[PDB]
Amino acid sequence: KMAKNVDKPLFTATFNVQASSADYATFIAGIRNKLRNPAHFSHNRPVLPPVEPNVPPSRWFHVVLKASPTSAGLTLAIRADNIYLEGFKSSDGTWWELTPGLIPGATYVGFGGTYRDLLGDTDKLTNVALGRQQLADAVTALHGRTKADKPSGPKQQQAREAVTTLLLMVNEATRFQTVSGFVAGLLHPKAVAAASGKIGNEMKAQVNGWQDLSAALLKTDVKPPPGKSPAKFAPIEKMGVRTAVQAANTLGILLFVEVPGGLTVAKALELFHASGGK
Numbered sequence: 709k710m711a712k713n714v715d716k717p718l719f720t721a722t723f724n725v726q727a728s729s730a731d732y733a734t735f736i737a738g739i740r741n742k743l744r745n746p747a748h749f750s751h752n753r754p755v756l757p758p759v760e761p762n763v764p765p766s767r768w769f770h771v772v773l774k775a776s777p778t779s780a781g782l783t784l785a786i787r788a789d790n791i792y793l794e795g796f797k798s799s800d801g802t803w804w805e806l807t808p809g810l811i812p813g814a815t816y817v818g819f820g821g822t823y824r825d826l827l828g829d830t831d832k833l834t835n836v837a838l839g840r841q842q843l844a845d846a847v848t849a850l851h852g853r854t855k856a857d858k859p860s861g862p863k864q865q866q867a868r869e870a871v872t873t874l875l876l877m878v879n880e881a882t883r884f885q886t887v888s889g890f891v892a893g894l895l896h897p898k899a900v901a902a903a904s905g906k907i908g909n910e911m912k913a914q915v916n917g918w919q920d921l922s923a924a925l926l927k928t929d930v931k932p933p934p935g936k937s938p939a940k941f942a943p944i945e946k947m948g949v950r951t952a953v954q955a956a957n958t959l960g961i962l963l964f965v966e967v968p969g970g971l972t973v974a975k976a977l978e979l980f981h982a983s984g985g986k
């Protein structure tokens with residue numbers, strides 16, 4: 709069935725694309741903070757609540773990206789359970805969606821939301837230029853989209869690149885301190901030359917293995933069976949992550965994963981609701 713409450717965000721995070729590096733870090737930190745299950749941290753990193761079983765996706769938040777403090781922003785509709793971008797709202801009021809039939813009253817943008825859909829391959833992630841101008845152009849491209857505009861291959865290619873830019877600079881930055889830190893480091897005052905950069909293979913591997921890295925750290929919290937030794941972190945070498953300390957410094961917020969001996973979906977949602985979570 710269709711998603712619910714896409715129009716009723718649990719919170720809205722706003723960033724002015726011309727704002728400082730520190731304000732970008734505050735913006736990303738605040739998203740993580742509002743997404744977290746207050747009852748579930750791992751090594752002092754927040755864990756998302758589980759995905760609600762046996763209902764359509766019904767927990768959403770909004771990100772608003774502004775070209776200026778007084779500009780109307782581009783609104784992104786993102787799932788609050790797995791931080792998946794599914795919709796965006798252009799200046800003419802049109803909700804555009806990345807999955808056909810998912811969001812009530814939305815218009816399908818013409819391409820899917822996966823990196824395979826956007827890039828052709830999750831390996832081209834290391835080709836995406838990240839920076840302040842790239843962010844501004846991305847907001848402009850998507851915010852400027854109009855329903856009435858006739859179909860265009862070049863316009864589609866622009867939109868795909870724009871969505872990819874935001875996924876890395878918003879969604880992946882939320883998920884990963886490596887990514888958020890990399891992006892914040894490219895953001896400078898106007899007295900500094902315009903800058904951009906591209907992620908390396910470690911951050912590409914992290915982005916492509918968010919569930920794996922999350923589960924790997926979560927397993928370390930599991931109380932060990934009688935007669936056996938407590939679980940040690942298992943390095944994911946492609947991610948450049950070899951210790952739990954490195955995992956914690958890497959993870960911005962963990963995807964909930966059921967690991968043997970860990971919290972179940974039901975139990976983790978129970979603790980989430982008990983701590984005031986919605």
Ligand SMILES: Nc1ncnc2[nH]cnc12
Nearest residue numbers: 791792793821822823879
């Ligand atoms: N639409 C999307 N939202 C979040 N992460 C993604 N990774 C690939 N596609 C994504």
